[PDB]
């Protein structure tokens, strides 16, 4: 991918770039999943051994405060601002807010809301004044790449994301193990209740949570499961990685062309009875200028 930017890339030191990042040492891990309830179209399988070079990855998804500093330094205009609208979950649209009649096929709970963007995540009248440490949302893949490049960083590949998110466990269901709520404690911000009608907020949040909410995983990463979907670098496919080759098993970058970029980790909307996509092996995608109230990103970097 060759992006184009309207701002110069600032000079940064290695110690500056590394702040708030964890160093993931080079090695192998078992990527993917073979849960028999996985949707075949998602291509969670096959489970395979992948070797990665050492890399750095953010402990936290990029926050509102951090994205605001990027915009202040660059004047960057997000895709949602250029389009003039972004997707908001229906329960979070205040009554009377102007809305487009647009319907996402098979997902009527998404509302296209004029004027919804990162600083007004539910549309005109909303603000992030009380969410400075929440993950930035309504950021497209393009916006995420622009931020990461400005920060001296990049998006993680899907394999880097999953190795970091698995936190040193071998083929566990979640970042922390195989139980959703070990010892009866919530470990991530997903949906409880009846999707999409009523979120009981049993885990504390019926929207995004601060980027440092909940226990981290074994590598020190926070909210890799739940909270917000996270953009990765790869083009999406369901079967490129089924090939057993160096390109798919050693620092794999995904297919060279595609239509949608990979997103990982699930969000505050995921639930077992609809998508079941908060398992660490889960994956989906979205087109690269798309944005939504449940999608953000964390950065990676080469040491």
């Amino acid at each position: 991918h060759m992006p184009s930017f309207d701002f110069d890339i600032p000079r940064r030191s290695p110690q500056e770039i590394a702040k708030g990042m964890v160093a993931i040492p080079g090695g192998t891990f078992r990527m993917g999943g073979e849960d028999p309830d996985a949707f075949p179209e998602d291509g969670e399988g096959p489970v395979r051994t992948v070797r990665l070079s050492p890399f750095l990855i953010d402990r936290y998804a990029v926050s509102n405060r951090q994205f605001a500093a990027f915009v202040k330094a660059t004047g960057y205009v997000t895709d949602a601002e250029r389009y003039g609208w972004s997707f908001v979950f229906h329960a979070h649209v205040a009554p009377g807010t102007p809305v487009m009649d647009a319907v996402v096929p098979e997902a009527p709970w998404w509302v296209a809301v004029p004027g919804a963007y990162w600083k007004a995540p539910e549309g005109p009248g909303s603000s992030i004044t009380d969410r400075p440490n929440h993950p930035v949302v309504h950021v497209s893949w393009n916006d995420a790449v622009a931020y990461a490049t400005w920060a001296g960083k990049r998006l993680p590949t899907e394999a880097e994301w999953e190795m970091a998110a698995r936190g040193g466990l071998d083929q566990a269901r979640y970042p922390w193990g195989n139980e959703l709520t070990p010892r009866g404690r919530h470990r991530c911000n997903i949906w409880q209740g009846t999707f999409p009608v009523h979120d009981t907020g049993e885990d504390g949040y019926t929207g995004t949570a601060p980027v440092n909410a909940f226990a981290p995983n074994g590598y020190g990463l926070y909210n890799v499961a739940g909270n917000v979907w996270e953009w990765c670098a790869d083009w999406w496919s369901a079967d490129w990685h089924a090939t057993e080759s160096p390109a798919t098993r050693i620092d794999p970058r995904g297919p060279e062309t595609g239509t949608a970029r990979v997103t990982k980790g699930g969000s505050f909307l995921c639930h077992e009875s609809y998508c079941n996509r908060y398992r660490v092996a889960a994956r989906t995608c979205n087109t690269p200028d798309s944005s939504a109230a449940h999608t953000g990103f964390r950065c990676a970097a080469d040491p």
Binding site: F39, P105, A107, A260, Y274, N286, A292
Partner: peptide
């Protein structure tokens, strides 16, 4: 009835 949808795309509403 079809694959659940978690990533709403701008193209999908056209």
């Amino acid at each position: 009835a079809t694959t659940p949808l978690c990533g709403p795309s701008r193209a999908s509403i056209l």
